DNA sequence: GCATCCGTGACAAACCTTCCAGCAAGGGGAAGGTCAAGAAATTAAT
DNA sequence: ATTAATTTCTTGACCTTCCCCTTGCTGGAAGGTTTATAATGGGAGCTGTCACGGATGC
């Protein structure tokens, strides 16, 4: 969760499009890891539809910078989600708020010259708790071209 | 001569002829089959040649007469 | 199709959108560059296109711009400034009636 | 081989080069990947595709090495023949070489005296030329149209012979003359007497004598047969995507051979003249687009709508073959990696990843695995590497020790941006860089991609270990101060170590030394701040290296003794007892390198970094909000500033001043408020209420978290703290002005959205400055590195006996730098002495190191004789005892040290960080120069001369204060009077330059007519006026015929003279001469008559020295300088000396401020026009010792004004290389008015005017060329063909036959041999002797 | 978790990261108070007063939200999400002054100075100065070390000038540019420059001989004719200019 | 002897000829690859 | 200082592919030649590239 915010975090996820956006608001009926089925209420119900807006969440696909894109579902089962809200956070969001990174204890002090010219000195818990580990999806197309031989 | 070559450059006089005769001594140490005058203590031939330079045992004319003695021994 | 595929993917305006963050996507979509045909180049520009004007208040943001050679050519759009029917940038304001 | 010889290509030479000729435009087959017979990639012409494998598959596998297969002509050899096989396209018609046609200069018209418009008329098939005619009407080189060709056909018939195009000019160049035209031009050059003709006929005759001397022919200049590039160099290779990878030069060669085949099909088919003339024109355009695509016309496009690369675009700028594939090239064993911090390492030690050292040291790994017996073969060791065996880490640790490696930042800023390192093996995937040398890199840890280069052989390994290791150089090549000084974090830890308190909870305990100091700091019972007495053992080598032992009690702190534990024996405690700022630690490292030498200094720097890291870990230096305190009287300063700008607005509304004076007043009061709030935050920051040992209240140096970064200068000057805690001073408007409303609030209070916009205006302006002008400084480094590409120390000392008189700058204000750091490392020329004429203590040739700079600092020295490189007599470099000291070593400079690229990296170092009431400030005696002074009737001394420079010399005997005084001043003190500081001693109105007369007599208005020359206008200000004159633009031709002049003589009709000279007392009357005195009054000597009124692009313009925006001309010969023709705006200027060049004239464009009048006495080399001076006339009149002194006093002060000190020798040897080509004045040795190099001029003096006979003519005149000009005037051509205009200088090298001896240092970089510099200088000593 | 450099603050004038660090320490103190009152499971109604007290400390907060209109389960989930720090917004130019950040530190059981007297890990002794410690919310970049570490040793050369390539996906080493050549020549290093431009990258018959010499242990400099200087030679010979060696 | 115009630096569609590889359904010549005979070179009786 | 049973050497005597070729087409690839109403001044940047010298025209 982004601790220090700006107020813009509540709209950048909904306006980016990579998250599950609420086109029609209602009550959560069934949430899977790869899809979210929200039951549309009667006020936002159309007679030409089925009253069910299933959001096919995009799984681990490749971006243009060799990193992961995963629309993780963040809402719980059995809770109302109104119009224009979040259902599944994207690759760098958390509950409709922009989760760019992680928050942890930082100390502005020198320690054995390791932070010499604005460098980072990390603890073990950034990888012991797997806080700063990152999925990176690359592409390697083994191409079988046809030569003369 | 691992951390300081200033004693070598003050006993020789300059940098370029020093490193040229040191590289000549190391080339005679690598494939020439010569024995080092400095103990190794798990070191490569370059710092051994530099330690032979800073001990006053290897110079320009000293390496000249050293290769001349080997040439006179081989051509005999 | 050759023209609309040479512009989409091979022009200086078309580039790889970094999809690592939603912030990167919405700052690359709201990115006002000045390269390609019609605009300037990174090597043939001066200090006039890079240094901002007092008319950049709210329309073209002076912050989000790369630190490379074209430091002022690739500008960006602010949050409240939209496009016009003509195409210029407009800033929304609240009207004051004598205080 | 030892030399590179260039000439023009003969068709027989191409026929010998060919070994196969191409006649068909086929490149390869489209189904099979085999070229067929007689093509652009063919096997008969160039060679086979694979190593020992023929075309059809009949002869292969080393069985047929030199036989030729009769089926397709293939010679079965290696692939190496595909990079050396030539062309010989059988051209049906001769064509124009566009390199010798459309260049600047074209070099085909200057051989013929034909303009380029007529060359375009004849080569493009539009106009005819006749080679010879029976009558004098159709002479040689006549330009005839087609109607004139028809008229000559019906008029002459078979008498004339006039073709069109490249064949006509080819026969004209072939059958003009060989040496008779050269002899006729040589006699007609000096037969005629002119200047506009003798600036191009001498270049024509030099071109022709180069043609006759180099054995070249003008037939070989034009192109009759075109050879193609080798096909491996233009490889049509199948890429791994399905399509092919071709070159655009293959497409241009296919188009050229297609137009050649169309011409060959047009010759036998009996074509009409229009189509064959268009075919030859199109072949000319095709070979023009192949050679240089951007000269003859529009750049030829391809399939992707792009200008295709020609043979000139392959060598042009950074994208050419030189700066991308020849000079700056990719290299193996180079690992791109980021920088990390290794603080547990020595100064010569860096980190290395085990994966990157595993893949990077693969031949060393395989050799050490085969020599130890742990691996059988190479691929078994490779499988041991690919599977990551346990023993390969141990063998990598064995091979990585005693094996230095080169760390390299890309791009480097100076010479210390790349140096060697002895790596250790750690985990991770990055390089742990030692923190002390990151300032020498100027590479902060921002993820900088550092390349790591492996020296392979033992020559390069010992060159890495003994010469370019970080333990070999503790100083910078730019200045004597160490740039490998303790940087920001460790200097903050050391400043926290050396700080003192008043409370000081370890009070009263007397410490036994450094041991007890570190003991009671580490035990926690005593703090790091305790003003106690410590018995410290100190040593000083007062004798010849003999240290003496002494121990006493000093008033110090505990942390200074803990630093003294890391300080070695040879340092004194006078450098350890102060506050120890960054400059103080620089002085400490400098004194350590001067006293102890390099042997304890590296270990001292490593221990200092270790102690600074260990006591910055325990420091807790943490910036906060309450640490960055707001001054208590901050809101009242902003309130008083608001009241002041309200008063300024009310004074602007109620009309008293204008808007410009309002802006100046609001800028002045905002600067005053900024200074007030800066002193307020400084008083609130530097003072802190702390308790004493008893109950007291005493202030001291504060323990604030930002005053440690402010006072010590760790990271950030005083302006950053004054803008952080206090308000912002001034910003930058994009038009160049300052915003009239500065930022009232500070950073801790917050900046408004308007105020952040006014801040980001100047911030984005400075960031655009850093984006553009630092790249401009990089190209300036590219410029300056290619004019000093031959300066190697060849000899030790030459007998020149001449140097420079060095003096510091006191220009305008007080002194800026002393003489000790100015002549630091320099070598004296003569036996300099004390200011008194006795006790000569300095020898002839000695350096200025310890026991020499302080020995002059204890004396009152002000100017010494220093030996330079501008007076060194030897060629192709300078001597060791003429330059001085190598700045990064600290001793006598070795033979081989290339000074010019040192100077280029030194001037390129601060390129990333550049972006009247004369009141004396000291006490001394008044001294002048070129004295013309007299006492008037008021008790003062006026000045009636122009070149008076007021200087102040105290009782000691040094020039502490100096000024530059113009003409028409009044001195309040006399010559030789002891004055005090603060008072004004020179009184003159700065808005006007008066016409003060030294003739004490009557006043007589003579040689003036009221109405024609002068007018009658009384001044309505004071009522004191006379017959005055207006400006010269309003007067009629009466002043143009009779010269107006004020002959101040006696009123009884007789004439008087000047006291001292024999000239009659007649002052001249220029414009704006409104006199304020009547006739008949007895004026005294010194009375006033009238009132006459008055940076990195600048660094690049001063280095180029081409011309400023306003050229300041100087007087040539000392004498009477008058006017020639009268002022038609910009008319003339004449100089009439008494024993000099009498009829020589000059030219004045702007008549704004004339220093000397038209008819007064001047000195040779005296200033005439005011403003920026053009150094061409300064070199033309003054010597090199004055121009070099002016440059090292101007551009070094410009670099010092930014806040960085550079040694003056680096801005001296570049200036020495800026006058490398000189202009000879008399014939007899080389030429009459050629531009010849100083080496070719020195080899002519030592051959004729030394031992052979007398003076055959060897005098010359030096010329400061531009940096773009001196790089095209080098005697070597292959280094000149890499900087810029490779087409132009390569054509100048081809038509002259410039055989390169490869004497310069880059000339062996480009050919790929050992350089004649450094360690390769001793190899070149045997190379040039055995040749 | 992170030890950051305080040296880059006064030169780069970024004092707002210190304000962000103090506000993050205050928000983390509120989060530890919520986690201490949550793991005991004492009551819920004290949290509805405490987090409401933590939501109003400025002059005028833009949202006057109340926890009295919420349910027990919603406040319990809000506190469970507030266990992992406290989400706190601050505008870019209407942000909090240091007085409200000091009030946030006072409400989270923290000193008003912002810098907490810290204890060292290596030596255990407490420093003489209090250390500014808190939350910066730093992010992982795209310039990771597995995308930055890239070396090259004799693999996949070119065909035009017989040159090593560039880029990690192309497996080519970093360019030894011309400024590095001038600096290496300013040192006077001749044998390293004769390797870096002739026998390590240029000569195809030279780098193979150098590799065979290093594999068999002979580290002797064997130079020769560069295979890209003759590229320029044949280029200007095909251009129509005669040139040869001595 | 001066103001003024270009290079050049910029971290279609049929028509007709020769030349060469494939599938019948394989045989033969040139050139290079493995099995049973007698000849060199060793040892146990004097 | 000897020679008689083993153990190699040498020599015919056989054993495979490589390549050209067998009559009879069958298809593919490379190169050159007509076709016959009327067809007659074609086409394309890109400058929003700025500041130097070197040669041209008063
Ligand atoms: Mg950087
Ligand atoms: Zn063949
Ligand atoms: Zn000399």
mmCIF file of N, CA and C in Angstrom, chain D residues 774-847:
data_model
loop_
_atom_site.group_PDB
_atom_site.id
_atom_site.type_symbol
_atom_site.label_atom_id
_atom_site.label_comp_id
_atom_site.label_asym_id
_atom_site.label_seq_id
_atom_site.Cartn_x
_atom_site.Cartn_y
_atom_site.Cartn_z
ATOM 1 N N UNK D 774 27.461 21.765 -22.068
ATOM 2 C CA UNK D 774 28.409 20.713 -21.713
ATOM 3 C C UNK D 774 28.732 19.816 -22.905
ATOM 4 N N UNK D 775 27.761 19.570 -23.788
ATOM 5 C CA UNK D 775 28.074 18.900 -25.048
ATOM 6 C C UNK D 775 28.903 19.797 -25.961
ATOM 7 N N UNK D 776 28.679 21.112 -25.892
ATOM 8 C CA UNK D 776 29.530 22.053 -26.615
ATOM 9 C C UNK D 776 30.954 22.044 -26.067
ATOM 10 N N UNK D 777 31.105 21.854 -24.754
ATOM 11 C CA UNK D 777 32.431 21.719 -24.162
ATOM 12 C C UNK D 777 33.071 20.385 -24.519
ATOM 13 N N UNK D 778 32.263 19.337 -24.689
ATOM 14 C CA UNK D 778 32.786 18.080 -25.199
ATOM 15 C C UNK D 778 33.294 18.187 -26.624
ATOM 16 N N UNK D 779 32.565 18.903 -27.483
ATOM 17 C CA UNK D 779 33.085 19.146 -28.824
ATOM 18 C C UNK D 779 34.245 20.138 -28.818
ATOM 19 N N UNK D 780 34.313 21.024 -27.822
ATOM 20 C CA UNK D 780 35.491 21.869 -27.657
ATOM 21 C C UNK D 780 36.707 21.051 -27.238
ATOM 22 N N UNK D 781 36.491 20.000 -26.443
ATOM 23 C CA UNK D 781 37.564 19.067 -26.112
ATOM 24 C C UNK D 781 37.996 18.283 -27.346
ATOM 25 N N UNK D 782 37.026 17.899 -28.185
ATOM 26 C CA UNK D 782 37.327 17.284 -29.479
ATOM 27 C C UNK D 782 38.124 18.232 -30.376
ATOM 28 N N UNK D 783 37.824 19.529 -30.298
ATOM 29 C CA UNK D 783 38.559 20.532 -31.060
ATOM 30 C C UNK D 783 39.989 20.679 -30.552
ATOM 31 N N UNK D 784 40.150 20.886 -29.243
ATOM 32 C CA UNK D 784 41.454 21.160 -28.651
ATOM 33 C C UNK D 784 42.342 19.926 -28.560
ATOM 34 N N UNK D 785 41.771 18.725 -28.665
ATOM 35 C CA UNK D 785 42.586 17.517 -28.635
ATOM 36 C C UNK D 785 43.225 17.242 -29.993
ATOM 37 N N UNK D 786 42.771 17.913 -31.051
ATOM 38 C CA UNK D 786 43.248 17.639 -32.398
ATOM 39 C C UNK D 786 44.134 18.750 -32.946
ATOM 40 N N UNK D 787 44.473 19.741 -32.126
ATOM 41 C CA UNK D 787 45.488 20.721 -32.484
ATOM 42 C C UNK D 787 46.806 20.473 -31.768
ATOM 43 N N UNK D 788 46.806 19.717 -30.672
ATOM 44 C CA UNK D 788 48.009 19.399 -29.913
ATOM 45 C C UNK D 788 48.304 17.905 -29.962
ATOM 46 N N UNK D 789 48.174 17.324 -31.154
ATOM 47 C CA UNK D 789 48.321 15.892 -31.376
ATOM 48 C C UNK D 789 49.742 15.490 -31.760
ATOM 49 N N UNK D 790 50.745 16.297 -31.400
ATOM 50 C CA UNK D 790 52.133 15.934 -31.653
ATOM 51 C C UNK D 790 53.073 16.331 -30.520
ATOM 52 N N UNK D 791 52.558 16.834 -29.399
ATOM 53 C CA UNK D 791 53.395 17.342 -28.308
ATOM 54 C C UNK D 791 53.791 16.204 -27.379
ATOM 55 N N UNK D 792 54.959 15.628 -27.647
ATOM 56 C CA UNK D 792 55.571 14.619 -26.794
ATOM 57 C C UNK D 792 56.917 15.156 -26.326
ATOM 58 N N UNK D 793 57.271 14.845 -25.078
ATOM 59 C CA UNK D 793 58.572 15.218 -24.536
ATOM 60 C C UNK D 793 59.643 14.378 -25.221
ATOM 61 N N UNK D 794 60.391 14.997 -26.133
ATOM 62 C CA UNK D 794 61.435 14.302 -26.879
ATOM 63 C C UNK D 794 62.787 14.411 -26.179
ATOM 64 N N UNK D 795 63.278 15.632 -25.996
ATOM 65 C CA UNK D 795 64.561 15.870 -25.359
ATOM 66 C C UNK D 795 64.352 16.295 -23.907
ATOM 67 N N UNK D 796 65.461 16.545 -23.213
ATOM 68 C CA UNK D 796 65.409 16.943 -21.812
ATOM 69 C C UNK D 796 65.444 18.460 -21.634
ATOM 70 N N UNK D 797 66.346 19.146 -22.334
ATOM 71 C CA UNK D 797 66.464 20.596 -22.223
ATOM 72 C C UNK D 797 67.127 21.137 -23.479
ATOM 73 N N UNK D 798 66.529 22.168 -24.065
ATOM 74 C CA UNK D 798 67.102 22.867 -25.205
ATOM 75 C C UNK D 798 67.643 24.225 -24.771
ATOM 76 N N UNK D 799 68.602 24.728 -25.544
ATOM 77 C CA UNK D 799 69.201 26.016 -25.255
ATOM 78 C C UNK D 799 68.414 27.180 -25.820
ATOM 79 N N UNK D 800 67.278 27.501 -25.198
ATOM 80 C CA UNK D 800 66.433 28.581 -25.690
ATOM 81 C C UNK D 800 66.722 29.919 -25.012
ATOM 82 N N UNK D 801 67.025 29.900 -23.703
ATOM 83 C CA UNK D 801 67.421 31.070 -22.904
ATOM 84 C C UNK D 801 66.385 32.195 -22.941
ATOM 85 N N UNK D 802 65.102 31.842 -22.981
ATOM 86 C CA UNK D 802 64.042 32.833 -23.093
ATOM 87 C C UNK D 802 62.758 32.240 -22.530
ATOM 88 N N UNK D 803 62.009 33.052 -21.797
ATOM 89 C CA UNK D 803 60.776 32.613 -21.167
ATOM 90 C C UNK D 803 59.773 33.737 -21.020
ATOM 91 N N UNK D 804 58.895 33.606 -20.024
ATOM 92 C CA UNK D 804 57.803 34.544 -19.793
ATOM 93 C C UNK D 804 58.032 35.229 -18.450
ATOM 94 N N UNK D 805 57.534 36.458 -18.332
ATOM 95 C CA UNK D 805 57.472 37.170 -17.060
ATOM 96 C C UNK D 805 56.076 36.960 -16.482
ATOM 97 N N UNK D 806 55.982 36.142 -15.438
ATOM 98 C CA UNK D 806 54.704 35.723 -14.878
ATOM 99 C C UNK D 806 54.260 36.677 -13.776
ATOM 100 N N UNK D 807 52.974 37.021 -13.785
ATOM 101 C CA UNK D 807 52.389 37.908 -12.790
ATOM 102 C C UNK D 807 50.940 37.501 -12.559
ATOM 103 N N UNK D 808 50.442 37.613 -11.329
ATOM 104 C CA UNK D 808 49.029 37.324 -11.069
ATOM 105 C C UNK D 808 48.137 38.468 -11.533
ATOM 106 N N UNK D 809 46.841 38.180 -11.593
ATOM 107 C CA UNK D 809 45.854 39.155 -12.048
ATOM 108 C C UNK D 809 45.288 39.916 -10.849
ATOM 109 N N UNK D 810 45.346 41.245 -10.924
ATOM 110 C CA UNK D 810 44.746 42.117 -9.921
ATOM 111 C C UNK D 810 43.806 43.025 -10.713
ATOM 112 N N UNK D 811 43.225 42.473 -11.780
ATOM 113 C CA UNK D 811 42.429 43.249 -12.729
ATOM 114 C C UNK D 811 41.123 43.699 -12.082
ATOM 115 N N UNK D 812 40.959 45.011 -11.941
ATOM 116 C CA UNK D 812 39.750 45.583 -11.383
ATOM 117 C C UNK D 812 39.729 45.606 -9.869
ATOM 118 N N UNK D 813 39.488 44.455 -9.258
ATOM 119 C CA UNK D 813 39.399 44.337 -7.816
ATOM 120 C C UNK D 813 40.726 44.011 -7.168
ATOM 121 N N UNK D 814 40.660 43.226 -6.097
ATOM 122 C CA UNK D 814 41.846 42.816 -5.357
ATOM 123 C C UNK D 814 42.485 41.610 -6.046
ATOM 124 N N UNK D 815 43.469 41.001 -5.391
ATOM 125 C CA UNK D 815 44.151 39.842 -5.949
ATOM 126 C C UNK D 815 43.244 38.620 -5.828
ATOM 127 N N UNK D 816 43.404 37.680 -6.757
ATOM 128 C CA UNK D 816 42.617 36.456 -6.787
ATOM 129 C C UNK D 816 43.444 35.221 -6.470
ATOM 130 N N UNK D 817 44.563 35.031 -7.163
ATOM 131 C CA UNK D 817 45.466 33.929 -6.888
ATOM 132 C C UNK D 817 46.870 34.466 -6.645
ATOM 133 N N UNK D 818 47.656 33.794 -5.812
ATOM 134 C CA UNK D 818 49.050 34.198 -5.604
ATOM 135 C C UNK D 818 49.939 33.710 -6.743
ATOM 136 N N UNK D 819 51.242 33.947 -6.583
ATOM 137 C CA UNK D 819 52.223 33.472 -7.548
ATOM 138 C C UNK D 819 52.725 32.070 -7.225
ATOM 139 N N UNK D 820 52.549 31.619 -5.978
ATOM 140 C CA UNK D 820 53.058 30.315 -5.556
ATOM 141 C C UNK D 820 52.320 29.178 -6.254
ATOM 142 N N UNK D 821 50.987 29.220 -6.252
ATOM 143 C CA UNK D 821 50.207 28.233 -6.984
ATOM 144 C C UNK D 821 50.167 28.500 -8.484
ATOM 145 N N UNK D 822 50.578 29.691 -8.923
ATOM 146 C CA UNK D 822 50.597 30.006 -10.347
ATOM 147 C C UNK D 822 51.839 29.438 -11.025
ATOM 148 N N UNK D 823 52.995 29.527 -10.363
ATOM 149 C CA UNK D 823 54.242 29.011 -10.921
ATOM 150 C C UNK D 823 54.500 27.666 -10.232
ATOM 151 N N UNK D 824 53.437 27.055 -9.706
ATOM 152 C CA UNK D 824 53.552 25.745 -9.074
ATOM 153 C C UNK D 824 53.833 24.671 -10.116
ATOM 154 N N UNK D 825 55.018 24.066 -10.034
ATOM 155 C CA UNK D 825 55.433 23.043 -10.965
ATOM 156 C C UNK D 825 56.156 23.552 -12.192
ATOM 157 N N UNK D 826 56.132 24.857 -12.436
ATOM 158 C CA UNK D 826 56.784 25.413 -13.607
ATOM 159 C C UNK D 826 58.296 25.475 -13.406
ATOM 160 N N UNK D 827 59.015 25.632 -14.515
ATOM 161 C CA UNK D 827 60.473 25.666 -14.521
ATOM 162 C C UNK D 827 60.928 27.073 -14.894
ATOM 163 N N UNK D 828 61.940 27.569 -14.187
ATOM 164 C CA UNK D 828 62.473 28.895 -14.455
ATOM 165 C C UNK D 828 63.340 28.883 -15.712
ATOM 166 N N UNK D 829 63.423 30.047 -16.358
ATOM 167 C CA UNK D 829 64.232 30.218 -17.560
ATOM 168 C C UNK D 829 65.612 30.778 -17.233
ATOM 169 N N UNK D 830 65.657 31.937 -16.588
ATOM 170 C CA UNK D 830 66.902 32.553 -16.166
ATOM 171 C C UNK D 830 67.121 32.297 -14.677
ATOM 172 N N UNK D 831 68.228 32.826 -14.157
ATOM 173 C CA UNK D 831 68.528 32.742 -12.729
ATOM 174 C C UNK D 831 67.803 33.885 -12.021
ATOM 175 N N UNK D 832 66.563 33.603 -11.613
ATOM 176 C CA UNK D 832 65.755 34.612 -10.939
ATOM 177 C C UNK D 832 66.281 34.829 -9.524
ATOM 178 N N UNK D 833 65.954 35.986 -8.957
ATOM 179 C CA UNK D 833 66.583 36.443 -7.728
ATOM 180 C C UNK D 833 65.543 37.172 -6.885
ATOM 181 N N UNK D 834 66.018 37.819 -5.821
ATOM 182 C CA UNK D 834 65.176 38.629 -4.959
ATOM 183 C C UNK D 834 64.752 39.910 -5.682
ATOM 184 N N UNK D 835 63.744 40.624 -5.158
ATOM 185 C CA UNK D 835 63.479 41.985 -5.663
ATOM 186 C C UNK D 835 64.660 42.933 -5.519
ATOM 187 N N UNK D 836 65.461 42.785 -4.468
ATOM 188 C CA UNK D 836 66.743 43.465 -4.425
ATOM 189 C C UNK D 836 67.730 42.814 -5.380
ATOM 190 N N UNK D 837 68.635 43.627 -5.923
ATOM 191 C CA UNK D 837 69.597 43.163 -6.927
ATOM 192 C C UNK D 837 70.823 42.525 -6.264
ATOM 193 N N UNK D 838 70.581 41.405 -5.586
ATOM 194 C CA UNK D 838 71.624 40.664 -4.887
ATOM 195 C C UNK D 838 71.153 39.224 -4.723
ATOM 196 N N UNK D 839 71.945 38.448 -3.964
ATOM 197 C CA UNK D 839 71.728 37.103 -3.407
ATOM 198 C C UNK D 839 70.890 36.142 -4.257
ATOM 199 N N UNK D 840 71.379 35.842 -5.461
ATOM 200 C CA UNK D 840 70.692 34.961 -6.403
ATOM 201 C C UNK D 840 70.689 33.544 -5.831
ATOM 202 N N UNK D 841 69.497 33.039 -5.513
ATOM 203 C CA UNK D 841 69.337 31.770 -4.818
ATOM 204 C C UNK D 841 68.704 30.681 -5.671
ATOM 205 N N UNK D 842 68.229 31.003 -6.864
ATOM 206 C CA UNK D 842 67.531 30.058 -7.733
ATOM 207 C C UNK D 842 68.430 29.751 -8.923
ATOM 208 N N UNK D 843 68.677 28.473 -9.243
ATOM 209 C CA UNK D 843 69.520 28.143 -10.402
ATOM 210 C C UNK D 843 68.827 28.356 -11.740
ATOM 211 N N UNK D 844 69.492 27.928 -12.815
ATOM 212 C CA UNK D 844 68.973 28.135 -14.165
ATOM 213 C C UNK D 844 67.752 27.262 -14.436
ATOM 214 N N UNK D 845 67.914 25.944 -14.337
ATOM 215 C CA UNK D 845 66.863 24.984 -14.674
ATOM 216 C C UNK D 845 66.510 24.182 -13.424
ATOM 217 N N UNK D 846 65.448 24.597 -12.738
ATOM 218 C CA UNK D 846 64.962 23.897 -11.560
ATOM 219 C C UNK D 846 63.443 23.976 -11.515
ATOM 220 N N UNK D 847 62.837 23.010 -10.829
ATOM 221 C CA UNK D 847 61.393 22.984 -10.674
ATOM 222 C C UNK D 847 60.973 23.796 -9.450
#
